[PDB]
Amino acid sequence: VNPGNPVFSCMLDPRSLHTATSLSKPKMIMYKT
Amino acid sequence: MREIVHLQAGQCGNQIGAKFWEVISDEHGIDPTGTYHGDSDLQLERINVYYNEATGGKYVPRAVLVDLEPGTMDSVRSGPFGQIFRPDNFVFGQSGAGNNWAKGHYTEGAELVDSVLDVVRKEAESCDCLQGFQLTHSLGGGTGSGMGTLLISKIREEYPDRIMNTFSVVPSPKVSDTVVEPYNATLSVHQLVENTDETYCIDNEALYDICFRTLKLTTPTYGDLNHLVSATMSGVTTCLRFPGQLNADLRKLAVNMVPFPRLHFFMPGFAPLTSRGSQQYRALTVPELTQQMFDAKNMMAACDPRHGRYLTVAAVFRGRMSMKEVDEQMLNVQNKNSSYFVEWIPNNVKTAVCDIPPRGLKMSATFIGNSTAIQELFKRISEQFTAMFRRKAFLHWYTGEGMDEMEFTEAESNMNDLGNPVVTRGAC
Amino acid sequence: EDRLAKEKREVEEARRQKELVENTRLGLNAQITSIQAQRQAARQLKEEEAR
Amino acid sequence: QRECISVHVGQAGVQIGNACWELYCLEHGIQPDGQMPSDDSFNTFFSETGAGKHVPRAVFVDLEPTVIDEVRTGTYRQLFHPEQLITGKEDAANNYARGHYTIGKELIDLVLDRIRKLADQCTGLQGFLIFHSFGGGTGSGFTSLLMERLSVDYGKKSKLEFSIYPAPQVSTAVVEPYNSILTTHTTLEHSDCAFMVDNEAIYDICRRNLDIERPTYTNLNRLISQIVSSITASLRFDGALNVDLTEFQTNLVPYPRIHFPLATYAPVISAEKAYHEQLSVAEITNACFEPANQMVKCDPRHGKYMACCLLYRGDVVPKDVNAAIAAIKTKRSIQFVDWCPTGFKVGINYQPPTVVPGDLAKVQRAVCMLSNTTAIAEAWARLDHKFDLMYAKRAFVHWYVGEGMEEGEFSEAREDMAALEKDYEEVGMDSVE
Amino acid sequence: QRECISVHVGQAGVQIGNACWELYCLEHGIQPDGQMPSDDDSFNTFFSETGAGKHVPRAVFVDLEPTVIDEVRTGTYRQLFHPEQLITGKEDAANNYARGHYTIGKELIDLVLDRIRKLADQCTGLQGFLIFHSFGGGTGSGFTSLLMERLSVDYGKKSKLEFSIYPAPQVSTAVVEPYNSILTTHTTLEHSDCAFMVDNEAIYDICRRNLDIERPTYTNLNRLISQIVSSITASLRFDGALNVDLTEFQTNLVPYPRIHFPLATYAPVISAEKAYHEQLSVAEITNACFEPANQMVKCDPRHGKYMACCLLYRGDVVPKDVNAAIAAIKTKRSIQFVDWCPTGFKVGINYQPPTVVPGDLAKVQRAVCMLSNTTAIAEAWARLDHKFDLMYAKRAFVHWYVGEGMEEGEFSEAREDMAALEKDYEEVGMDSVE
Amino acid sequence: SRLQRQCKVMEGERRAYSKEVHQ
Ligand SMILES: Nc1nc2c(ncn2[C@@H]2O[C@H](COP(=O)(O)OP(=O)(O)OP(=O)(O)O)[C@@H](O)[C@H]2O)c(=O)[nH]1
Ligand SMILES: Nc1nc2c(ncn2[C@@H]2O[C@H](COP(=O)(O)OP(=O)(O)OP(=O)(O)O)[C@@H](O)[C@H]2O)c(=O)[nH]1
Ligand SMILES: Nc1nc2c(ncn2[C@@H]2O[C@H](COP(=O)(O)OP(=O)(O)O)[C@@H](O)[C@H]2O)c(=O)[nH]1
């Protein structure tokens, strides 16, 4: 809600934040378990 | 599916709880209207724990708001993410608690707690577990204490087997804000003790320190101070939302954190809290996190644990982290420091990991400690109230509002008979 | 990116203090012009009563 | 939504009201003929008349004309409703017996009937603000009779007085001690909180900080207007600690009889002085407790503070307020009562002070410091000593007793003042049990 | 951060402060309007802040007699100072310590302590006070005595450096300067933390000698004093290889509770058409400091023993050419020290060259302040006690003092205390034989 | 005199204990 708050907040695009491997699928890496 | 309603009451709860919703919304994707303009599906697979869906992708927040003076209410609305609450939830009461624990548990209050319980009941039936509740109040004051107690009582009186994690701003130790800060509280603690399941005394003087000693926040509005309070509230109830490994809900915490049925007042604390310049110099890792998780500096309370013992402490970690590192730091920070942690209860620490980390951080945690040192904050209130009931000062007000002297003595007795226990089971 | 967001709030506080001190300067300059206008009226009153 | 009714009784009350409603109009942007050139802000001291105009929730009462007629001829003629402005036909003549007993019955029924529709045109009534003096017969007696009726009528609503204190050294009338003692005898049992503002202290402040070598009622009354607009801004705007009049009055009175707090203003800077000072949050709080900026001529060194509410208006960092209050509490010169450690009461609003064309400098911080002190016991004792010499020889009492008053009431006017002096000694002595 | 409060009392203090703040404004960069022509914190110790950076000095200009603050309030710097910062009385002290300390002191002492209170409030951690007066006039003697008493009461743990103007042996301006000097030194012997002594006569003689001015005035004299105060307080103002503080000067200069009276002098006081001809090294400037004609007090240093010595080099000075110069002065014989203090010369190095105002001094890249604590001041003290004794033999001018309100016994108490001071001067003098 | 407090707080505890014996 505020991009200066004491604890974190970021507006970097989360769909680009994904990595795959040689034999995997692109995992959505901030909300994967 | 579990369910937690966020009862808010008074200028304190209003702004604090407003900040709660803004923080939890972002972490769940919900926008300032209700549409899930979010990303991961793992954010909606469990939103029935804070937001009831309204025909039309509008996830509406289950938030009952109780103010006894349409004013902090208008604030809640105007606020950007403050148009998502359902009209009825806003229970106004054109009058004025006039900072009087009496004028809130007796007069103005009664003629509103009926309407309050109404909203609550409705939101309490629309559930499939009603795990518990969550009150945001300022122990010291009126609309916070008066209503808080009346409401908290009514809730426990009816719903018998359900948690009630209250996040209260205990009266400060340095400067005060309401001359009747002692009285207002002594009458309150009395209730909170024999009714709730898990308070989180969030003292104000603390947040201020965290603002100038750890964050270096130069000009700290009452907004930044809230975000801290939000982080904790959220973390505590994270496992009952996103998934992870050793999950622990709210009953888990209580059952594994309340030694005897009374030592429930706990101490909050976030984890990755860095700075506006040092952040580029700090490397996040279970190790570092701990030296801060246990740095009394964080503990947003007022009783440097150093001057007391530690009955039970739980730390709900969040983020991809190795449990070896987790258990390690936990034990290591329970051996080096041992004169503090009590011994009549081994394995004092309590771990917990809810995978999905905060939005914009690699790892996080919420330290909730049950210190015997809390006697400090209590002692002050007692001694303060002491020299206040003696020379019968600022009492004419409360008295007139139908509150006999004993009603105050009985209260003082309790917090004193609550101060003793902390030492009784704080000596071993 | 979190670091740059916090720097942008630093710049936000900078623009807040700049606009507030500039509003202060314009308002108080208006006050100074008013009080010199009153003084000039006083001197004109002095001259006309001398006449 | 949350409204409080303003009453201006006596000539002092009427011109304080002129200054204050000028201030409120230039606060809220009201053109001074009622119409507002373009929602939940004006509807607490202003009632919109269904179409376009905003009539104040004020009643201006005087027992004698020309004071109301200045308003009825002047610029603010169109602002007020021409029946709220109530005039008698014969002056109180600086007589308590005429303010209270004999010429009170031709006006008090109209005044209470007029307060009645202002209460009816109000969804939530919250309090009254009665503006008067402890001097003239009007501001003594009609205020006394007004509170006697309002205690019967609206007893569960707060009553805040703005009293002009009878000056310790200068005065303007020889029957000020008589009128003051009688009117405070009567308003002790009916008032709720009576903020006190003395003339001679502002006489000193207008030389010391305002650098005005020749000030007058316009400047004095506009500073007191700044005081009242400073305290009644929490329920006028949105604030970080919005704080009601009931909250003002619940944290300033220890006992049911001690209800006389003294105001002070901060930034009393004088335009061509604010180029060189911070006017920062710590130093405005430091300048509050200076024993020269008191609005009542009374040294706080010979007394103890009971409870004190600070109202910060403008861009104030509430934690800079925290640091300032921490700095105040440690000093050994600002001595408090031992039974009340919790002394300094924060109230925060985001509305900056607005400049009336005139003398006070434009500032972004303004804290109004209302303190209840044991130091006003010496001022009450001085007023009682003024009472004693004139009562010892039946001076000027034939005028009162021949016009409705009795010789009897002067007695219990003296012994309840003795009881008040004893009460202030009881609250001033240290607790030993 | 390292804030210092300046208090200019008396006419001498006020005009020395005029030259002092003129030099400070020209050195930092503040124009006399107070606005900063920027286009970082090296203003913070003397000047302070407000909205939009109107830089205001932390001085208290006090005079019991008007018009002397009024040329300041109507002059070029009418807006630099805060308007009621400068505190003006309406009763001349009439060259009377007893009136400046006993009758006209109470109408102003409360208000000047109020102003010192709020100026000290406008500080983070205050380093010290610099008080400026003379041992002459009544304002300078009496009000400084009362001010030192009240500042020592309220701020007892604090450094109080003072620049007194000495009653000269020969020139004189009043005839009760011995009375005022002995009384004010009795009062300030127990309170003044360090009293740097500056006599007019040696300034007059060096202005004749090496400034090449046959016709100078107090603008020039107070300008040189502005130079010497800007020299002593510059390490808390800029950075240096060897930074030196006011507490460091307190520690270094004075060994005993009472002999706290240093003697200052300057270096390159060269005169523009004289400066192109000359080396400006680090060695000959120290030689010129120890040359027995360029002192600021008319007192022969060869008739005494040096007790301590602090030197404050400013500009392009090498902190081992200072080693070479100090080694040379140790090898020289006529500069003779006490046998109980072998370590004598205290180095201070600053990177900022002296900034000259339009006036007398020249473009110099090296200037060393000199503060020498010596036993030679006993001769000057006995010289003033000589005048006080022959004035007090026949009760000259004593009826004003006794009729304003101070009793007769203060004169005898002052004489006994200054006899004790002279015995302290002689006992710190001889070599140890035990 | 002024029994008040007796009947008030005792009535509170009576109706309390009666309620958690109904449940
Ligand atoms: N600010 C302000 N104060 C006033 C004014 N008039 C009177 N006072 C104060 O009131 C005191 C005496 O006037 P009042 O008590 O108001 O007399 P009154 O209420 O007009 O009573 P009457 O003589 O019957 O008309 C003086 O000592 C003043 O300090 C005024 O016009 N403006
Ligand atoms: N640089 C400088 N030295 C001065 C000045 N005025 C006086 N002195 C020296 O101070 C001695 C006495 O002057 P003061 O002590 O300042 O007298 P005063 O402060 O005016 O005291 P009052 O006359 O009572 O107001 C003289 O012998 C001078 O040598 C001055 O204006 N500038
Ligand atoms: N954490 C947090 N605390 C706040 C905020 N606003 C106010 N408070 C605290 O709330 C306290 C006052 O609450 P109180 O007077 O009892 O309000 P009431 O319940 O309406 O009577 C003050 O001490 C504030 O510090 C906020 O936005 N966040």
TrEMBL record, chain A:
Compartmental location: Cytoplasm, Cytoskeleton, Cilium axoneme
Protein name stated in the entry: Piercer of microtubule wall 2
Assembly: Microtubule inner protein component of sperm flagellar doublet microtubules. Interacts with CFAP53, ODAD1 and ODAD3; the interactions link the outer dynein arms docking complex (ODA-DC) to the internal microtubule inner proteins (MIP) in cilium axoneme.
Superkingdom classification of source: Eukaryota
Species the sequence originates in: Sus scrofa
Automatic annotation (TrEMBL), chain B:
CDD domains: beta_tubulin
Residues covered by the Tubulin/FtsZ 2-layer sandwich domain: 246-383
Superkingdom assignment: Eukaryota
GO terms under cellular component: microtubule
BP GO annotations: microtubule-based process
Keyword annotations from UniProtKB, A to Z: Cytoplasm, Cytoskeleton, GTP-binding, Isopeptide bond, Magnesium, Metal-binding, Methylation, Microtubule, Nucleotide-binding, Ubl conjugation
Pfam family, one: Tubulin_C
Family stated for the protein in its record: Belongs to the tubulin family.
Function: Tubulin is the major constituent of microtubules, a cylinder consisting of laterally associated linear protofilaments composed of alpha- and beta-tubulin heterodimers. Microtubules grow by the addition of GTP-tubulin dimers to the microtubule end, where a stabilizing cap forms. Below the cap, tubulin dimers are in GDP-bound state, owing to GTPase activity of alpha-tubulin.
Record-given protein name: Tubulin beta chain
Gene name of the encoded protein: TUBB4B
Automatic annotation (TrEMBL), chain C:
Protein name: Cilia- and flagella-associated protein 53
Compartments, record wording: Cell projection, Cilium
Family per record: Belongs to the CFAP53 family.
Organism encoding this protein: Sus scrofa
Covered range of the whole protein: 207 to 257 of 514
UniProtKB/TrEMBL annotation, chain D:
CDD domains: alpha_tubulin
GO terms assigned for molecular function: GTP binding; hydrolase activity; structural constituent of cytoskeleton
Sorted UniProt keywords: Cytoplasm, Cytoskeleton, GTP-binding, Hydrolase, Isopeptide bond, Microtubule, Nucleotide-binding
Provenance organism: Sus scrofa (Pig)
Domain Tubulin/FtsZ GTPase: 42-239
Gene Ontology cellular-component annotations: cytoplasm; microtubule
Physiological role: Tubulin is the major constituent of microtubules, protein filaments consisting of alpha- and beta-tubulin heterodimers. Microtubules grow by the addition of GTP-tubulin dimers to the microtubule end, where a stabilizing cap forms. Below the cap, tubulin dimers are in GDP-bound state, owing to GTPase activity of alpha-tubulin.
The protein's name: Tubulin alpha chain
Primary localisation category: cytoplasm
Quaternary structure and partners: Dimer of alpha and beta chains. A typical microtubule is a hollow water-filled tube with an outer diameter of 25 nm and an inner diameter of 15 nM. Alpha-beta heterodimers associate head-to-tail to form protofilaments running lengthwise along the microtubule wall with the beta-tubulin subunit facing the microtubule plus end conferring a structural polarity. Microtubules usually have 13 protofilaments but different protofilament numbers can be found in some organisms and specialized cells.
InterPro entries, per database record: Alpha_tubulin, Tub_FtsZ_C, Tubulin, Tubulin/FtsZ-like_C, Tubulin/FtsZ_2-layer-sand-dom, Tubulin/FtsZ_GTPase_sf, Tubulin_C, Tubulin_CS
Signal peptide segment: none
Family recorded in the similarity comment: Belongs to the tubulin family.
